[PDB]
Every structure is written in structure tokens, then in C-alpha cells.
């Protein structure tokens, strides 16, 4: 019911007095009610995860994809609340970016896939430079555009070779073709590396990162998370190459070393940009699997909630700095937020549990993300890639704990006299409380996805 | 399929070795999207009626919006329309 | 001298905070020629090197998989 929402509120932004801080309240509550009254498709979802196909080219996989779009709706509700409560007229293209991402998580066939990845990429190119009175965003948007164009024709050249070897298009027609003509394998790894532009696999590495630091913080939350889940959710929904046949494992080896060897960083945005890169590199390891999606579906949410959480926490930490950076981007250095525990240390507690999330101390997240990841690995037998994932987790934990160790040393001179800034506090408290109480209901989901 | 791979590869490594003129890079990236259609159309001709040529009319209609967003974003590679700067 | 050895054990941990602190500058110095302006050209030549090295290493793979120096020379950078 997103298309109706888009065509409604593009008419609503038309003939508006450029107040433009109310329309997001309407979009937030509309997506909230749509999720609340559209969760009733979960009963008709799965008897044995029975797929349902729109017109032969679009697929609805009711256990996987019906959870993915619910996560999309959830993080969109969070972003829409984050803009409420500095803005231009933009939520129309937020929603159509969502439309493209949900198409690629529902795309059975490559025509829908290519249309929707390019629609999605155009949305990213636009959102990067809506804040056009920047010199950061002006450079970053054009860089993102040119390389998205290269990676777009890489997509289309992979699929055009795929059409050149087989007159069909659907991966439904791949149907365990076990004679496995070798160019089918090479086409498929080319399509894999094409879709893997967004994760910034270590030869495609640096270019995303300057873009992430050259957007405003209200934007880099949105596009360190949307295509991160989108293209990979496509990539796990259809398991292109059962194993790597050493092509992709090399990409993640040089990634999960060569992006965690990017340790010394003083810029905040670079730091958690590498975080969101390497934790996206994690879930590439079970792109190397077959018949395994539970670890992936759980790891998306039990990563992305916390990614959203740490961005919302360093949003809240602008108020306490006694210096700011540029008009669009407040807090880029780690050493800006030094004595934060002598400020409202409950958010320091939240920042603590969401960074201990990312290092994966057991009783909240890591024994339920990384445990499922490691059981999916060692089910297959990738014994070496286990220990390099462990090395990646330790060295990632080092710059993760860099944030907490700079977070709570000692303040120079700041305690307390203020007014309040709240009513979005329940959002950050909801993400932090769902982060550190998932150990309660960590078995109910184990049954529910066993029945889907 | 020599005819499309050669124009694709030359547009591609023109986009690599482009140490002059941002817009020549931009139009080489454009001409990639017509180096790919000479592959796609002759594969469809060697096969059949409309199976891949539907994707061809899709990539034409979308390559338009590619160049549109690329221009309307290249306008904002700077300040806007024109002011004092350096 | 047993204590002097026990500091050689910190020489198995000090460099984990030092050889990684050379790996960081080595990883951040590569593809950082211009790095404020002109950042398109670095990345474009880089993804050319990506597709060339990766297709060439697929060719290296399916002739003699024992030849595993082409990754180990890439670890010489970081």
C-alpha cells in the first residue's frame, strides 16, 4: 500500500506552504498503521513457506521476504521519526527508494531486478544531494553517481551474458542445472560482484566511505542501512553460487581483514562506516551457503536495529560537545564526545550495550547473531573462514571499544543546567531495550521460523 | 557480439583513463549503456521475438533517466547557479 | 631473564597494537593520492584493477590451485 501512499503524499507536498515538518508525521503514522493492520498476512504466509508469484516475474517468499519488508517498514518508521521532533521536501523519494528496495527483495526475475536496483540507485543519487548547500554532499553525490553507473552496467552486462547463454531470464529456470556450463558460473559470480557494489568489498572499498563522511548524519543513517540489507537480502533469497569456488571467499577475506585493518580512524563517520561495512561483510559469508537463511534473516535485524541505535545515540550526543562542526554535520570527531558519562550517563549505558552488541558479548546479541553465523559456516565446512571471522571480530572489537573508551574518561567542565529534548526518547529506548532483552524471547523466534 | 563488447570495453577503459574532462567520463559511462544493447539486440535477433528486446526498451527508457539525473546532479557539483567562490 | 622473556610475550601483544598501527597507515595510504579532490580517478583505476586481478586470479585458480602467493602478496600491503 506504498504506491497509494506515494501518490497521495506527492499530491500532499504539492500545494503545501513549505511547513514540511508535519507531512513526515503523517507518513510515520501511516506506515505505523499500515504495519499494524498489514501484519495479518502472516497467518496466510506459511504452511510450508509456500511462495506466491505475481505474474511470473515477481516473487513473494512469505517467510523471508515478508519479514524483510517488515524490517524495511520498521526502520523507515524510525527514520521518519528521526526527521520529526533540519529538513527539505524529500519523503516522497524516501518512500520510492523503499519501493525499489522492496521490489529487489521481491524480484524473481532480472527485468524487475534491474529496474528496481536502478530506481533504488537513482534514489540514492538524489538523497545524497538534497542538502545542496554543501561542498561535502556535492562531491559525494557525483562520486556515488559515477560509480553506481559503472556498477549498474556491470549488473546489466552480467545479465545480458546470462541471456546470451540462455534465452530465459528467470532464476526459477536455473532449477539445479547440474551439467553447470562454466560460463553460467562465471556469469553468476559477475552478477554477484555486480550486486555487491554496496557492501564495498575491499577492492571496491574506499569510495563509499568518503561519501558516508560527506553526507549529513541524518542521511548517512539511511544509506548505510537500506541497500546494505536490500541487495544482500536478494542475494541470500536466491543462493546464486552454492559455495564460492574460490572467488567470493577471497573477496570477503580481503574485506574482513582489509577493512578491519582500517583501525586507526579519528573521524566518527568513517569509524562506524567501517563498522557497517564489516558487519555487512559478515553476512556475505552465508551468501556462500545453500538452504540457509535463518542466520541471515536473524542477523539483519539483530544488526540493523543496533546500527540504527548507535546512530541515534550519537545523534543525541550533539547536545554535549561545546563545539560543533559544519551546519550539515555536527560531530565528526571521536574526541568531540569525551566526558559523556558525566553528562546523561543513561545514554552512555545505551551506547555501551549497543557497542558491546557489535563486539558480540553473549547475553544480548552476538551469541545470537554470530552464533547463527558460525553454525551456518561450520555446517558447510569452511573451517579457515571461521578463524578469520574470529580475527575479524576481535580486531573489529578494538575500534568498537575505542568509542566506549573515549566515551567515558573524564569531562573537562560540564555537569548540569538545561531544558529538555525528548518524545523521540522512546525510539532509542525501544531499540536499546530490544537489543538487551532479546535473550528473553530468543527461543520463540526459533520456533516461529521453524514453522516458516 | 564483437560489435557490442568492443564499444563497451573502450567506453569502460575510457572511463578509467580519463584524466581530463569529467563530462567525457560521463558520456563514456553513457555509451556503455548503448554498448550493451548491441549485445542484447543481436542476441535477441539470433534467438527470437520479444524476450530480450523487452529488456532493451526498458534499458533505453531507463538510460534516459540516468542521463537526466546525471545532468541535474552535475549542476550541483559546485555551489548552485552561480555565486562568489574562491 | 625469565622476566625479559615475559616481555617478549608483550612483543607478541605490543605489535598487535603496533603492527596493526603500521597496517592502518599502510591501508590508508593506498588509493590516497589526491583523496580530497580527484577521487573519481583513484576509484575508477581501482575497480579496473579489481576486475583485472579477479579475472586473472580465476585463471590462476583453475590451472594450479597450489599457487597461493597472489593473495599473500596482497597481504604484503596491509
Amino acid at each position: 500500500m506504498l504506491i497509494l501512499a506515494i501518490i497521495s503524499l506527492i499530491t500532499f507536498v504539492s500545494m503545501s506552504k513549505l511547513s514540511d515538518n508535519r507531512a513526515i508525521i503523517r507518513l510515520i503514522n501511516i506506515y505505523l498503521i499500515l504495519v499494524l493492520v498489514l501484519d495479518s498476512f502472516l497467518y496466510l504466509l506459511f504452511l510450508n513457506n509456500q511462495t506466491y508469484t505475481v505474474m511470473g516475474e515477481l516473487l513473494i517468499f512469505n517467510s523471508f521476504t515478508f519479514y524483510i519488508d517488515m524490517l524495511i517498514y520498521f526502520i523507515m518508521i524510525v527514520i521518519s521519526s528521526l526527521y520529526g521532533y533540519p529538513k527539505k521536501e524529500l519523503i516522497i523519494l524516501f518512500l520510492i527508494n523503499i519501493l525499489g528496495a522492496l521490489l529487489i527483495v521481491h524480484s524473481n526475475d532480472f527485468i524487475t531486478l534491474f529496474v528496481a536496483i536502478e530506481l533504488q540507485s537513482y534514489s540514492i543519487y538524489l538523497i545524497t544531494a538534497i542538502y545542496n548547500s554543501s561542498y561535502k554532499a556535492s562531491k559525494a553525490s557525483m562520486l556515488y553517481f559515477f560509480m553506481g553507473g559503472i556498477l549498474s552496467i556491470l549488473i546489466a552486462y552480467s545479465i545480458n551474458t546470462y541471456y546470451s547463454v540462455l534465452n530465459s531470464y528467470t532464476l526459477h529456470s536455473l532449477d539445479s542445472l547440474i551439467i553447470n556450463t562454466l560460463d553460467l558460473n562465471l556469469i553468476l559470480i559477475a552478477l554477484s560482484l555486480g550486486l555487491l557494489f554496496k557492501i564495498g568489498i575491499a577492492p571496491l572499498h574506499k569510495w563509499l566511505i568518503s561519501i558516508y563522511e560527506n553526507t549529513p548524519i541524518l542521511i548517512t543513517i539511511y544509506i548505510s542501512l537500506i541497500p546494505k540489507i536490500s541487495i544482500l537480502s536478494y542475494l541470500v533469497l536466491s543462493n546464486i553460487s552454492i559455495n564460492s569456488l574460490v572467488i567470493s571467499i577471497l573477496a570477503i577475506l580481503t574485506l574482513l581483514v582489509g577493512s578491519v585493518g582500517g583501525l586507526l580512524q579519528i573521524k566518527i563517520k568513517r569509524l562506524l562506516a567501517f563498522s557497517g561495512l564489516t558487519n555487512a561483510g559478515y553476512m556475505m559469508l552465508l551468501l556462500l551457503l545453500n538452504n540457509n537463511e535463518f542466520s541471515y534473516l536473524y542477523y539483519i535485524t539483530q544488526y540493523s536495529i543496533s546500527h540504527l541505535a548507535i546512530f541515534m545515540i550519537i545523534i543525541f550526543s550533539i547536545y554535549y560537545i561545546n563545539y560543533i562542526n559544519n551546519q550539515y554535520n555536527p560531530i565528526i570527531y571521536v574526541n568531540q564526545l569525551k566526558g559523556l558519562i558525566h553528562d546523561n550517563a543513561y545514554l552512555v549505558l545505551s551506547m555501551a550495550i549497543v557497542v558491546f552488541s557489535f563486539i558480540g558479548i553473549p547475553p544480548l546479541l552476538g551469541f545470537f547473531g554470530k552464533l547463527n553465523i558460525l553454525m551456518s559456516i561450520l555446517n558447510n565446512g569452511y573451517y579457515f573462514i571461521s578463524i578469520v571471522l574470529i580475527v575479524a571480530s576481535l580486531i573489529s572489537a578494538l575500534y568498537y571499544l575505542y568509542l566506549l573508551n573515549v566515551s567515558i574518561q573524564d569531562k573537562n567542565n560540564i555537569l548540569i543546567n538545561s531544558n529538555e529534548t525528548v518524545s523521540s526518547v522512546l525510539s532509542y529506548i525501544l531499540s536499546s531495550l530490544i537489543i538487551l532483552i532479546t535473550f528473553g524471547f530468543i527461543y520463540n523466534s526459533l520456533i516461529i521460523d521453524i514453522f516458516n | 557480439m564483437f560489435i557490442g563488447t568492443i564499444i563497451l570495453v573502450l567506453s569502460f577503459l575510457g572511463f578509467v583513463f580519463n584524466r581530463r574532462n569529467i563530462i567525457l567520463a560521463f558520456i563514456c559511462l553513457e555509451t556503455m549503456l548503448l554498448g550493451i544493447n548491441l549485445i542484447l539486440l543481436r542476441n535477441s535477433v539470433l534467438f527470437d521475438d520479444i524476450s530480450g528486446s523487452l529488456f532493451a526498451i526498458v534499458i533505453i527508457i531507463l538510460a534516459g533517466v540516468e542521463s537526466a539525473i546525471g545532468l541535474s546532479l552535475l549542476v550541483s557539483y559546485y555551489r548552485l547557479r552561480g555565486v562568489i567562490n574562491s | 631473564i625469565a622476566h625479559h622473556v615475559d616481555k617478549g610475550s608483550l612483543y607478541r601483544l605490543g605489535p598487535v597494537g603496533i603492527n596493526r598501527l603500521l597496517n592502518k597507515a599502510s591501508y590508508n595510504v593506498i588509493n590516497l593520492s589526491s583523496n580530497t579532490r580527484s577521487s573519481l580517478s583513484m576509484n575508477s583505476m581501482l575497480i579496473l584493477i579489481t576486475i583485472v586481478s579477479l579475472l586473472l586470479l580465476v585463471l590462476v585458480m583453475n590451472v594450479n590451485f597450489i599457487i597461493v602467493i597472489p593473495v599473500l602478496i596482497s597481504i604484503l600491503y596491509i
Binding site: 561542498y135 551546519q327 | 555565486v83 | 595510504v29 583523496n35
Partner: peptide, 29 residues
């Protein structure tokens, strides 16, 4: 090691992946 910044002027220092030379100390129109 450690570095910090509270005053950024005479910008465009080349020898860095990303330096302390920011983008908006003052704008112009």
C-alpha cells in the same frame, strides 16, 4: 596515536586520506 581539532584554517592539505580541513568554516554567495 591521537589528534584533535578546534581551529581549521588555510585548508586543502593534500597529504591525508581525510584531513582536518573541513568544508564549511565560512560560505559565500
Amino acid at each position: 596515536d591521537l589528534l584533535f581539532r578546534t581551529s581549521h584554517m588555510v585548508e586543502d592539505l593534500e597529504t591525508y586520506d581525510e584531513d582536518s580541513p573541513i568544508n564549511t568554516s565560512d560560505a559565500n554567495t
